Subunit: 103 residues, 5 copies
């Protein structure tokens, strides 16, 4: 299995790593129908989503989507430094696949 | 694919953005039958609810309603500044659709 | 749809409001069979339960009972001031229907 | 319903109260098959488990077992003083039935 | 019924204890399909995973896998010292079976 986010990210089509090394600037979440999602930004303007669960996701990803939103909310509230995001870049905002936190 | 809470809010009828830029002043939650809900207020007095789940909600919203109550509680306890709420204004208190937090 | 805990409480028979304006003094929780419940006290001696889920409860209250126990535990651990409790007074200890927190 | 952990404990055979009045010294948890359990210790060496869910438990206890592990983890991390444990002392280590926390 | 992580770990084949006595240096989590996993590292370079749930896991392990990822995230965020990990050594990175925290 991959040993880090960069190696994990490389296993997928249409992805890239963004290196932030910064805390989350804003956290947004929605319960509106068909927009049950989270959006984060950083002070540099970079904006990312956790996608609404859909047909593009296999069953095993559903629990992981819910965990990711949990992770982003607590990272935001604790001012935890986000190291990198692995994202899909065929979505706008880019869609989070993985997160690493360090320092 | 909203970039932010304002754009997301604008996808729905009967909504508006409240800009608070302040911590939650009070947090109330109920397990009473047919009133399984949360209510928050801000220091100015403004009051908002997370609605009881009902027939106006699609299935995918159910998990998101539970998440929103989780978010409001932890935001309250951590004194996190709420930037904006997207709310449905055809309810009283106005009903929360989305929240943004920023320092 | 109520603006506050006092108005919510008044919608039900066998209820009353306790105004505590104090942090929780003790938090007790049990996983023993037929006593899967929480009990809290305040410095003044006042004691309250979250009831064991039972046939008096409608399905929609089940998730809310679990949320209330979550709320009491974190309120206790963070020393959050409890403003009011709405309780059913036909049980001993009085059974929590709703909580409000404000400083 | 019982008003406190001592009275609750007394409703069950093969139990006792341990009065600790101390924070948890160590927290251990396992996902290994048939040992999906938690173990805590105190500085005096006293050791307790949350048992693996089994046939001795009724269905209503399953959620409560999961909650208890949640409570012990956060008690451990916040250095919350444990007042008492109600345990079954027909198991080694003694098996937790209930916990009380008071400052 | 084990009283500590070392004895628990020894009940299984293909396991070993790693003694860290250090906080987690990095926390990584992925929602990408077939890589719904967590990875942690320590400042000594040591890397561990929580495996993707799979055929090797019995049903009772599923909830425990989810709990372990919750535990690692909060341990990371609170800078809690990890004492030991029990891991399976027939995976790369080694796969977490149990964790102990002390001091």
């Amino acid at each position: 299995t991959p040993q880090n986010i960069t190696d994990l990210c490389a296993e997928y089509h249409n992805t890239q790593i963004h290196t932030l090394n910064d805390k989350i600037f804003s956290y947004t979440e929605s319960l509106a129908g068909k927009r049950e999602m989270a959006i984060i930004t950083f002070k540099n303007g970079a904006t990312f989503q956790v996608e609404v669960p859909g047909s593009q996701h296999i069953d095993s990803q559903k629990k992981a989507i819910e965990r990711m939103k949990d992770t982003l909310r607590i990272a935001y509230l604790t001012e935890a430094k986000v190291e990198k995001l692995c994202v899909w870049n065929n979505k706008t905002p880019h869609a989070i696949a993985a997160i690493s936190m360090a320092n």
